[PDB]
């Protein structure tokens, strides 16, 4: 029985390929077709396709075409020496709010001022002078930000293999693979150190990383309980409407209607115990005979250490130091309320000049909202990092970090890849061609 080569056409062999997926949403409105009214899904069966959420070529497709639509809605610096002082007053301590000098011819809260001093003889009077935080940055443009559940769909000729195994870890094989032409609701909300309005899991809290035994790799933690948060600004600002230029607007809002209550947040301490208690129970598995110590973040730029929000159109920077702040020797221990349970707060600062889109560098201006601001979201994910230190005595310290901006989207695109169908394949058999 001599074998012979035979070519077949219609083989189900797959090949991972890249493409330019198109958006889809209900209602930000350019190039996005409406959602599919018939979201078909076919379970393949006994297939084991090795996934890899870290080497995925879809996260780059989402990181791009989102700075692109962001730039389409932003199509100016005027850095002059300011002059201000402390405001006339869980309480606000120092929040400078004043007006500047000459605009063309003859209120910047706290993280957008840089102190200076002239060379005159006014040093005996203590006359301070400020400057904008992005005075020497490339382009400072000026403009509602509401996340819409964008759906990425595959083009003609390509498919999407969505796994369904509830025990994901990031890489390795899957056992329940199904094909879909689109995806679930993806909220493009930007934030650091915490993932808001994400997607909960189906089993216990799972962690995932490219190499858990490495320190530079981001450790994405997906929860299974929508921990709520209540961040609000109890102040009241009024639109100044300063016009500078031939038909140009600017809004350096501010009013004294009791500027003493500092904007903060509220997190359920009872719910926060059950979350971290299950996380340490999972981290102890990969890290045996060790103490999972949580600690304060790093330093440098103020937009790194703090959490980034978006509440109705204003950005909040909150000190996340009261969060995690413990040692956690064994599983589910080391509590600290002594019978309190009094809503652990987070003091927050508010910026106006935003170093928009981490990686390139092109700031923008956020127009303030007239009145009180109140928002509420669900803390569903967590970004972490491990400090590789030689003083490791069974205490591997973890920090919130924040990592790259792409890590906020790898926690939602970890379930699928884009494949191409190669239809021809060869195989040997016993037939022979007549000649």
């Amino acid at each position, epitope marked *: 029985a001599k074998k012979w080569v035979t070519v077949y056409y219609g083989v189900p062999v797959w090949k991972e390929a890249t493409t330019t997926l198109f958006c889809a949403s209900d209602a930000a409105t350019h190039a996005c077709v409406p959602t599919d009214p018939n979201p078909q899904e076919i379970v393949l069966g006994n297939v084991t396709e090795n996934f890899n959420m870290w080497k995925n070529n879809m996260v780059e497709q989402m990181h791009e075409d989102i700075i692109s639509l962001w730039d389409q809605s932003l199509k100016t610096p005027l850095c002059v020496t300011l002059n201000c002082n402390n405001v006339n007053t869980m309480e606000t301590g120092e929040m400078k709010n004043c007006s500047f000098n000459v605009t063309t011819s003859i209120l910047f809260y706290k*993280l*957008d*001022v*840089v*102190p*200076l*001093e*002239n*060379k005159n003889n006014i*040093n005996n009077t*203590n006359i*301070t*002078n400020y*400057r904008l*935080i*992005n*005075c*020497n*940055t*490339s382009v400072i443009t000026q403009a509602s930000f509401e996340p819409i559940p964008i759906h990425y769909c595959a083009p003609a000729g390509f498919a999407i293999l969505k796994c369904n195994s509830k025990t994901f870890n990031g890489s390795g094989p899957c056992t329940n693979v199904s094909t879909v032409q689109c995806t679930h609701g993806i909220r493009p909300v930007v934030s650091t150190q915490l993932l808001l309005n994400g997607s909960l899991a189906e089993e216990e809290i799972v962690i995932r990383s490219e190499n858990i035994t490495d320190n*530079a790799k981001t450790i994405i933690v997906q929860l299974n309980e929508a921990v709520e948060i209540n961040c609000t600004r109890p102040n009241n600002n009024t639109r100044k409407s300063i016009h500078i230029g031939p038909g140009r607007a600017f809004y350096a809002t501010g009013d004294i209607i009791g500027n003493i209550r500092q904007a903060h947040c509220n997190i359920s301490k009872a719910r926060w115990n059950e979350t971290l208690g299950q996380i340490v129970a999972k981290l102890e598995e990969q890290f045996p005979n060790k103490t999972i110590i949580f600690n304060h973040s*790093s*330093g*440098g*730029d*103020p937009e*790194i*250490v703090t959490h980034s929000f978006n509440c109705g159109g204003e950005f909040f920077y909150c*000190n996340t*130091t009261p969060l995690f702040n413990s040692t956690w020797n064994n599983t589910r221990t080391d509590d600290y309320p002594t019978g309190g349970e009094q809503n652990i707060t987070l*003091q927050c600062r508010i910026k106006q000049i935003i*170093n928009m*889109w*981490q*990686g*390139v*560098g092109k700031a923008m201006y956020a127009p303030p909202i007239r009145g009180q601001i109140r928002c509420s979201s669900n803390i569903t994910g967590l970004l972490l*990092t491990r400090d590789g230190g030689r003083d490791q005595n069974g205490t591997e310290t973890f920090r919130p*970090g924040g*990592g*790259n901006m792409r890590d906020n989207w790898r926690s939602e695109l970890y379930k699928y890849k884009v494949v191409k169908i190669e239809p021809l394949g060869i195989a040997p058999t016993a037939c022979k061609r007549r000649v």
Partner: antibody, heavy 127, light 108 residues
């Protein structure tokens, strides 16, 4: 521990492009701002600018406006410094520094005082 | 714009004395935020104080910063031979800041 290791010496002809590199080891390079200063034998130190590897924000002094450019690699934990033009007066020892951590009770620029320096490389224009 | 001045340039000191430093800037620092360095010959520079009076990490208690306005001073109680180096002054961290002249803790 935190340590910055620079590259070796690089003697180049006047009109070339010297590429001085930095290397972060004991921390996360994508979170701190890197400074570059210059030191001439007998003179004083002099700031050359900084680069923010997090958001790509670059700012260089007016004296080195069209002469020195800044580039950084996040995935390699290295910061680079290119020079457009050269001159025999640029024979000096180049450094590399790192800003400090940010506290909750200070201005956004009160923590750029160059905490950790580096083993300074030297360049010679005409030997 | 900003030019720093230091005095004295030399110090005829012995191990166990006290040194006097001064950084009279051309301007007057409003925030009162400066820094001081330690540059040994051959080695890498080292930060002395990360503020007008806030010392850096690992720096001993012998170094102590003080002053305000334009009288940016320093003092070294019970000097040691392991600190004989060049000391520089700072202004601030902003769009423009210069460096000091440089003192020398001479053994003679």
């Amino acid at each position: 521990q935190v340590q910055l290791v620079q590259s070796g010496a690089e003697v180049k002809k006047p009109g070339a492009s010297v590429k001085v590199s930095c290397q972060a080891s004991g921390y996360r390079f994508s979170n701190f701002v890197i400074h570059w200063v210059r030191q001439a034998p007998g003179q004083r130190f002099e700031w050359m600018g900084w680069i923010n590897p997090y958001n790509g924000n670059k700012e260089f002094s007016a004296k080195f406006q069209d002469r020195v450019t800044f580039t950084a690699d996040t995935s390699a934990n290295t910061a680079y410094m290119e020079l457009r033009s050269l001159r025999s007066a640029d024979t000096a020892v180049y450094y590399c520094a790192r800003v400090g951590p940010y506290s909750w009770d200070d201005s956004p620029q009160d923590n750029y005082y160059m905490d950790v320096w580096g083993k300074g490389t030297t360049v010679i224009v005409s030997s | 714009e900003i030019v720093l001045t230091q005095s004295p340039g030399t110090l005829s000191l012995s191990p166990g004395e006290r040194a006097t430093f001064s950084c009279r800037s051309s301007h007057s620092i409003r925030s009162r935020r400066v820094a001081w360095y330690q540059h040994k010959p051959g080695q890498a520079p080292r930060l002395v104080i990360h503020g007008v009076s806030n010392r850096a990490s690992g720096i001993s208690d012998r170094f102590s910063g003080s002053g305000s306005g334009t009288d940016f001073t320093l003092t070294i109680t019970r000097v040691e031979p392991e600190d004989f180096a060049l000391y520089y002054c700072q202004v601030y961290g902003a769009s423009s800041y210069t460096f000091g002249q440089g003192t020398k803790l001479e053994r003679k």
